[PDB]
Structure formats: C-alpha cells, structure tokens
Design a protein around this ligand. Structure first.
Ligand code: CDL
Ligand code: PC1
Ligand code: PC1
Ligand code: ATP
Ligand code: MG
Lengths: 96, 74, 231, 108, 256
C-alpha cells in the first residue's frame, strides 16, 4: 500500500524522469558484450588443457597420475584389461 | 497486447529456470540467480499488473464521466 | 615423430622453465623495523594446519556418498593424495613461488572443498558414474555365475591358456616363451573379439566372418537419417 | 550413530579402553587395518610409521579412524605429531586423563 | 576464552585467525564422522548463503562484543563521545563540518570497541622460543611431539589490588579505561614421546619499550610457571617470576 510501489509505474514515467526507458537499453547491450567476452575467455581454456595433458610429458621427468587417471585405471577397466592381467599372472606366476 | 506479451516473456523466464532447474538449484555458482530471480520476477509482474490496473481505473473514470456529464447537458 | 626445434622455447626473463617467480617490475623488497610504521599484509603461518584440516575434510565429506564401499574409499584416497602431493613432486620450485606457494595451494584446495561440501565437484559426479558402470558390469558377471554360465572373460582366459599350449608344444628348438609372444597371441584374439561385439559370430566362420555384412546396406525404414538429407 | 557398510546401514559401536594393554592392541589392529601399511607383522610399539609406507597424509586417515571408533574430536594441531605407534598410545592416555580430571574433552 | 566461536567443532583457537578462500560457506559444518547421504540436506534452502554469513560471521562477532562488553564501559565511551556527537548533531543542518564532528566520535568509539573486544593474542612464537630454550622442559617436551589439550587466555576484569599495581589508581586513566588490560591463562601441553603433561600458567601485562609514547609489548609475560608431570615425576619450573620482574618494569596504562 505504501508509496514505494509507485516505482513500478511506466505509463506515467514521463512525468518524473523518463530515464528508465533508455538506461536499460545500455544494460542489455552491456550484458551482451560481457557475454561474448567472458564466454570466450572461460571456454577457450580447453585447447591448452587438451594439448598439455597429451604432449607435455617427457622421458627425463616423472608423470604422476591424477585423480581421474586413478579412478579410470581401477574402476573403469574393460574386460580385455581384466583378461590380460590374469593371463600374465596364470602363465608366469602360477604355471610358469 | 502489451500486457499479454510481457506476461508471456515473464513465463518464458520461468521455463528457462525450469528447463535449467538442476543447475540453478544445485550449482552454487548460480546461487544469486536462485535467490534473486523471484524478486525480479515480482518486480516485473508488478509493472505488468500495475499498468493494466491503472489503465483499467482510468477507463472506468472516463466512462462514468461522459455518462454523467451527458445527462446534465440533456 | 616430431620434436620441438626451438632451443629457446623454455626460456623466460626469470630463467629456464621458471614458472614459480616470473620477472615483474614491482619485485619483493625487504622491510626494516626501525623505519616501518605500519603494514598491511595477509600472509601468516597458518597454512600448514590448514593443509592438514583441508585433507581431513575433503576425505570425510567425500566418504558420505561412498556407501561404505571399502575398495572405493581406498581408491579415492590414492586419488586424493595425488592432488595434495602436487607441490612436493612437481618440477616447479613451490618453495620459491612469488608470494608464498603454501598459502596459494591451500587457498586453491579450499575452493575445491567448498564444492565438495555441496557434492557438486566434478570428481565426485565422475566417481559415481564411473563406479555405477563398474558395478553394473560386475553384477552381470555375478548373475551369469550364479546360473552356472560362463563369463566372456573366463572364456578368453581358457581360450588363451590352450593356445599357449599349442604354440609351446611346437617351440622345442627354443624354450623361452617370452612375454612378447604371450602378448601378440592375446592381442590377435582381442582384435577378433573386439570386432565380434559389433558383428557377433553366427556360424563356424567366427566373429565378424561374413563378407555379406560389408555389402551395400541401407538405413531401416523405421530409423532413417534424422540429421540430414539422404539424396 | 549408523553408517553404510558395503551398501548396508550398520550401527556404529564406540569403544572405551581405559587400560594400557587395550590401547597398544587397538593401535596395532588399527595400523594393521590400513591398506597402505607394509610389514604388518613387523609392526610393534616402537615402529616408525615412515618405515611401513605411511606419510603425513596417512596419519590423518588413521586419526580420522580414531574419531570414528572412540568418538574423539582431534584437532589439526595434534595430528601432524602422530608418527609412531607410541605416539597414539600416549595421546590416547592423555585424552583419558584429561576427561578424568577436567571433566571435559580437550580443546579441539 | 575464545570470543569468536561458531557451531564448528574443530580448531576453536584458530577460527578467527584462519582466512578461508571460500566464495561462500560450506553446506554443512565440518563432519566429526562419516555420515550418510540422507543425514545431510541436498540443495540447501533458498537464501542459505546469507543465513550462513549471519550465523557464522555476524553472530559470533556480536557474541564477542557481548562477551567482553565490560571493557568498553568507560566514562569516555559512555558519556564523552556520545555527548560530543549530540552537541554537533543539533547543528548538522547548518554546515557539513557539524556532521563530521558529530560522526567522528562514533567512529572513534567503534575503533576502541573493535580493538578492545578482540581475543587477546600474545606473540606465541616468542613463548615457544622461550620454553624450548629451557633444559628442564626440552627434557620432556619437543615441538615435533608436543600437542595442545586446552587453551585459555582472557583479560582480567576491573582494577587490580591497589598495592601490587598502584599505577591503575589514576583518575585520568580510569576515565578512559574500566579494565586493566592484563590477561591470565594457561596451556595444557602433552608430549607423545615421553608421555609427560604440564600446565603452563602465565600472566601478561603491557609494558613500554625503548620509546616514550608507544607500547613495546602489549602482552609481556611477567609471570611464567610450568607444573610438569611425568610417569612418576612431578616438577615445577619457574621461567619468569613476578617478584623479580615487577621490580624492573611496570605496566603501560593504555589511553584511547
Ligand atoms: C518458421 C515459422 C515460424 C514459426 C514460429 C514458431 C517457431 C517455433 C517455436 C518453437 C519454440 C516454442 C516451443 C513450442 C512447443 C513446440 C513443441 C516442442 O517443444 O518441440 C518438440 C519437443 C521435443 O523437441 P525435439 O526437437 O523433438 O527434440 C529435443 C531433444 O530431444 C532435446 O530435448 P529438450 O527437452 O532438451 O529440448 C527442448 C525443446 C522443447 O522444449 C520444450 O519442452 C517445449 C516447451 C516450451 C514451453 C515454452 C514456454 C511456455 C510456458 C508455459 C505456458 C503455458 C501457458 C498456459 C498455462 C495453462 C495452465 C495454467 O526446445 C525448447 O526448449 C524450445 C524453447 C523455445 C525457447 C523459449 C524461450 C522463452 C524465453 C523467450 C521469451 C520470448 C517471448 C515468447 C515466449 C512465449 C511463451 C509462451 O517436444 C517436447 O519437448 C515434449 C514435451 C513433453 C512434456 C512437456 C511438459 C510441459 C512443459 C512445460 C514447461 C513449463 C515451464 C514452467 C511453467 C511456465 C508457465 C508459467
Ligand atoms: C536505532 C537503530 C540502531 C542502529 C542500526 C545499526 C545497524 C547495524 C547493522 C547494519 C550494518 C552492517 C554493516 C556491516 C559491515 C561490515 C560487515 C560485518 O558485519 O562484519 C562483521 C564482523 C565479522 O568478522 P570479520 O569480518 O571482522 O572477520 C571474520 C574473520 N573470519 C573470516 C576468519 C571469520 O564482525 C564485526 O565486525 C563485529 C560485530 C559488529 C556487529 C555489527 C552491528 C550489529 C548490531 C546488532 C544490534 C542490532 C539491533 C537491531 C536488530 C533488531 C531486531 C531486528
Ligand atoms: C541518519 C544518518 C546518520 C547515521 C549515524 C551515523 C552513520 C555513520 C555512517 C554509516 C555508514 C553506513 C554505510 C556504509 C557501511 C560502512 C562501510 C565500511 O567500510 O565499514 C566497514 C567497517 C570495518 O571496520 P574495521 O575497523 O573492523 O576494518 C576496516 C579496516 N580498514 C579500514 C583498514 C580496512 O565496519 C563498520 O561498519 C564500522 C562502521 C561503524 C559506524 C557506526 C557508528 C556508530 C558506532 C557504534 C555506536 C557507538 C555508540 C557509543 C557506544 C558507547 C560504549 C557502549
Ligand atoms: N614481519 C611481518 N612482515 C609483514 N607482515 C607481518 C609481519 N608480521 C606480522 N605481519 C602481519 O600482522 C599479523 C599479526 O601478526 P601476529 O604476530 O600478531 O600473528 P600471530 O598469529 O598472533 O603470531 P603468534 O602465533 O606468534 O602469536 C599477521 O597476521 C601479518 O599479516
Ligand atoms: Mg598471537
């Protein structure tokens, strides 16, 4: 009921300032601009991440396993991998 | 027509939140949208209904005057 | 195959391969008590204990969604240690970082924990998906074993054990059945088994042993090309 | 007081040692239960955890387990000094003595 | 006593010191055990980040001011500064200089209330350097094997005995301070290698050093005592005795 709700009026906004109708135009443009710029920055980290994780290793240094590489090796191995390990163990460790 | 469009565009935002409910609700990077989306929605609804309500009042004031003033002139 | 030819690729203004203290104009300079009135600095000596509690939290808060899976708790620990051991094993001299590498890494791990407390960290959602796919494959083996049926993994092991006997029964001149020979035999079977999944073995021909499958084919009437035109 | 164990909800049980001999046995059973421990039978009261494949991060997992079994709240300032079996035995005693004299748990 | 305390169970003596890099606060408080997915609430309620900042940052900050409210009830903060603000507040509409001279004494009070309500922090590194230099303590305690069991350190209320410290019987100093600025506490220590425990009692007071107006050390240990207890040996070490220290140096009597 208070007079603070009068700020919702736009039919008679030309009686006080007539400014809201032009400022939001800039705000929408400012958002569009930042959307293009920020999306380009945060998205374009993937080429660097993709290249380094596949071409940055060298033989004179140790490559340490990451969290994902631990879960995949231990909890994402396929059937062929399970067969190969047991195949090596039975022939050499059991059957010699 | 203006009130119907602005009501459909507001409903469009509700779909955008519903279509992406799991992200707005669970991802904390979007907490500010989860918290302030309804405040903006009410302020938008208020403008939509405020204008419709005010226009409705004026139309009724105009209609009751021309009828009363006409009978006086008759 | 291809090696970097530029010899100055790893050169920086701070030295060779220096990613701990890049050269900048506003360099750190000392402070003298007798001449210093006041100072505003955020560095402290609390990073060690914060490095300890951060581990305890990230571990204990992740175990809430492991459902008592002991093999998963131990696997997660190995992965969690790989994340905390980065400063101790990296080529980067973490002790020479610009403004304190200890505070830097601790503040970084704190951002990971915040996401962990909400169960929104990509490592958590990735661990759940990876584990569910693993148990679905392990349960398929269990259901086939309770029925006395043979698993596709055991059929390969039995098929490989007999092939070794056939290949070593003729290897009398030598008697060194190297691990190299054991491998190529298994890979040859894998390639035939791998192609068998998409094209199963209908007859004595074996897995993917039909030439007619590679003749001209057409999409079925009930599933045409949905993404583009066909002609 | 309940926890999941292999997908099943199980009620957690807490222990009360209040005896030196029961502590030395619990710590060894605890350290021998950790999947990172080497030479589990060579482990004794005077065994350095470093000599059994354990580092600073492994002592945390062990302390985290002491809180589960006994209900203690161990502070981060006390964990990094637990590098021997003797240390867990003396710390557990100091906690039992503190609660028996001060009537409250130590500062966490 | 620690004034800043949340519902977090761990590291009570570091809660105000640790500066976390979190954007917001964690969903749940630090767990003391492994819980179930249903023990915690997924997708916490709306306006949860604001609720946490109030109960984890604001509320424990106000409990500190309330816990130590007896240190700000001096005639300078209670009557002088508020009265100075009202004198110029009646002329706030005449010029801007009156608005300033009316708000300054309020900002000054907050600063004194701010600094006086903080937990008393001594230079703990100076302390450990002092005890590790004693041979009777290094015999049973070492930093690689020592652990803290309890910690208490709080200001002493009101003025002290006006025979041991006659300095505080100064009406000019009493006009600005209602407390003494001295603190008393202890340290419950334990050594996991030797199995020894000791209670390190200490009394502190601010002292002047090497200068005329500035304080040298706001927390100077003029009494430092250690009651060491081992397997079957009880020792009492006196690193700093008050009878010999109070004859050389006297308190500072902070003003403002
Ligand atoms: C060249 C000629 C030009 C013609 C012009 C028209 C051009 C075409 C217009 C197309 C866009 C409009 C879509 C109209 C429907 C078309 C059917 C369709 O969707 O395509 C087939 C579509 C499948 O898509 P597909 O291409 O085959 O494959 C998709 C993939 O599988 C992937 O699956 P997917 O689900 O992820 O794919 C989603 C898919 C389809 O998504 C959908 O689920 C379709 C539903 C969209 C609803 C649009 C909002 C309406 C809100 C409800 C209003 C109800 C009013 C009456 C209320 C009465 C009860 C009180 O795409 C969309 O989301 C389309 C969204 C379009 C953009 C909307 C942006 C709005 C903001 C901008 C506002 C601008 C002002 C105008 C706004 C007008 C609003 C009225 O069919 C379905 O999705 C079946 C849905 C079955 C369950 C639906 C249950 C109801 C859901 C209602 C949501 C409620 C929201 C919260 C309440 C809000 C009310 C307060
Ligand atoms: C007649 C009306 C009375 C006057 C109204 C005054 C309103 C005061 C509240 C609004 C101002 C908020 C400004 C905050 C700006 C700084 C941010 C901050 O708060 O820091 C907190 C900080 C938080 O700590 P910190 O930010 O310094 O450091 C935290 C350190 N870590 C991160 C490690 C935890 O604490 C303080 O500043 C001290 C407490 C100040 C309390 C503020 C005023 C509280 C008023 C309580 C009584 C109000 C009664 C009214 C209620 C009636 C019922 C509805
Ligand atoms: C009607 C209008 C006049 C209202 C009264 C006067 C208002 C004064 C101006 C209010 C500004 C509010 C909006 C800005 C918010 C502040 C922004 C900010 O930076 O503050 C952060 C500050 C942080 O201060 P800080 O010292 O903790 O940390 C900042 C350190 N630096 C500066 C280095 C970065 O926290 C505050 O909000 C303090 C503002 C205090 C103002 C309150 C005045 C009243 C004092 C308390 C009552 C005392 C009565 C006497 C008591 C007697 C003994 C019991
Ligand atoms: N030599 C210094 N150089 C730069 N900044 C400093 C220096 N000493 C302190 N600071 C800053 O002043 C803050 C307070 O210092 P202070 O010695 O009181 O911390 P503290 O944790 O209480 O030490 P202690 O544990 O020994 O009591 C510090 O957190 C720091 O940001
Ligand atoms: Mg201190």
């Amino acid at each position: 009921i208070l007079d603070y709700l009068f700020l919702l009026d736009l039919n008679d906004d030309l009686t006080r300032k007539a400014v809201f109708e032009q400022v939001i135009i800039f705000i929408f443009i400012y958002c569009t601009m930042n959307f293009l710029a920020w999306s380009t920055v945060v998205e374009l980290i993937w080429p660097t991440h993709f290249f380094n994780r596949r071409h940055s290793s060298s033989q004179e240094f140790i490559r340490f396993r990451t969290y994902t590489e631990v879960l995949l090796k231990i909890s994402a191995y396929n059937d062929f991998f399970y067969v190969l390990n047991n195949y090596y163990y039975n022939q050499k460790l059991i059957l010699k | 027509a203006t009130a119907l469009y602005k009501s459909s565009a507001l409903a469009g935002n509700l779909f955008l939140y519903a279509y992406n409910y799991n992200n707005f609700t669970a991802n904390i990077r979007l907490r500010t949208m989860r918290y302030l989306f309804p405040v903006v929605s009410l302020a938008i609804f208020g403008n939509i209904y405020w204008d419709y309500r005010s226009q409705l009042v004026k139309v009724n004031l105009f209609d009751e005057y021309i009828q009363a003033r006409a009978q006086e002139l008759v | 195959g291809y090696k970097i030819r530029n010899k100055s690729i790893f050169w920086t203004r701070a030295g060779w391969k220096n990613n701990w203290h890049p050269k900048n104009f506003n360099a750190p300079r000392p402070s003298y008590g007798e001449f210093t009135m006041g100072i505003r600095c955020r560095n402290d000596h609390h990073s060690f204990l914060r490095y300890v509690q951060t581990y305890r939290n990230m571990s204990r808060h992740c175990k809430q969604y492991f459902l008592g899976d002991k093999q998963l708790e131990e696997t997660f620990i190995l992965g969690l240690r790989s994340l905390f051991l980065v400063p101790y094993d990296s080529q980067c001299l973490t002790d020479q970082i610009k403004h304190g590498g200890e505070r830097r890494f601790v503040d970084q791990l704190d951002r990971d924990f915040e996401l962990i407390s909400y169960n929104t960290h990509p490592y958590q959602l990735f661990t759940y998906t990876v584990r569910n796919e693993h148990l679905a494959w392990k349960n398929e083996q269990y259901e086939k074993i309770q029925k006395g049926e043979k698993t596709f993994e055991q059929e390969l092991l039995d098929y490989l054990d007999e092939q070794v006997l056939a290949e070593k029964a003729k290897l009398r001149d030598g008697q060194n059945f190297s691990i190299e020979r054991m491998t190529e035999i298994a890979l040859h079977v894998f390639r035939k088994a791998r192609a068998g999944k998409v094209r199963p073995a209908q007859d004595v021909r074996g897995p993917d042993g039909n030439v007619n499958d590679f003749l001209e084919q057409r999409r079925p009437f009930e599933h045409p090309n949905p993404t583009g035109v066909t002609h | 007081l309940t926890q999941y164990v292999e997908g099943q909800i199980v009620n957690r049980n807490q222990l009360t040692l209040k005896k030196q001999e029961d502590i030395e046995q619990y710590v060894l059973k605890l350290v021998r239960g950790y999947f990172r421990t080497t030479n589990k039978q060579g482990l004794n009261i005077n065994s350095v955890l470093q000599d059994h494949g354990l580092d600073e991060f492994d002592s945390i997992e062990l302390a985290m387990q002491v809180e589960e079994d006994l209900g203690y709240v161990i502070s981060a300032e006390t964990i990094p000094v637990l590098n021997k079996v003797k240390h867990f035995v003396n710390y557990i005693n100091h906690v039992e003595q503190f609660k028996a004299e001060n009537g409250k748990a130590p500062i966490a | 006593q620690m004034g800043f305390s949340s519902d977090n169970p761990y590291n009570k003596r570091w809660e105000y010191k640790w500066k976390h890099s979190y954007y917001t606060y964690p969903r749940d408080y630090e767990h003391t055990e492994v819980r179930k997915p249903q023990d915690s609430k997924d997708v916490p309620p709306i306006y949860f980040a604001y609720y946490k900042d109030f109960v984890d940052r604001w509320l424990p900050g106000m409990n500190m001011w309330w816990q130590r409210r007896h240190r700000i009830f001096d005639k300078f903060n209670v009557y002088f500064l508020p009265g100075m603000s009202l004198f110029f507040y009646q002329f706030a509409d005449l010029a801007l200089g009156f608005k300033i001279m009316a708000a300054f004494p309020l900002f000054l009070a907050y600063t004194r209330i701010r600094d006086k309500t903080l937990d008393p922090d001594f230079k703990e590194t100076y302390l450990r350097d002092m005890i590790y230099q004693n041979p009777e303590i290094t015999k049973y305690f070492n930093e690689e094997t020592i652990h803290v069991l309890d910690y208490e350190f709080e200001y002493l209320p009101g003025y002290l005995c006006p025979e041991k410290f006659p300095e505080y019987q100064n009406k000019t100093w009493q006009f600005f301070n209602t407390d003494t600025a001295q603190a008393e506490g202890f340290f419950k220590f334990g050594d996991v290698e030797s199995g020894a425990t000791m209670t390190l009692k200490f009394k502190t007071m601010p002292i002047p050093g090497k200068f005329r107006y500035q304080v040298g050390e706001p927390f100077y240990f003029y009494d430092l005592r250690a009651e060491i207890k081992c397997d079957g040996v009880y020792k009492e070490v006196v690193l700093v005795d008050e009878k010999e220290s109070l004859k050389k140096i006297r308190p500072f009597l902070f003003l403002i």
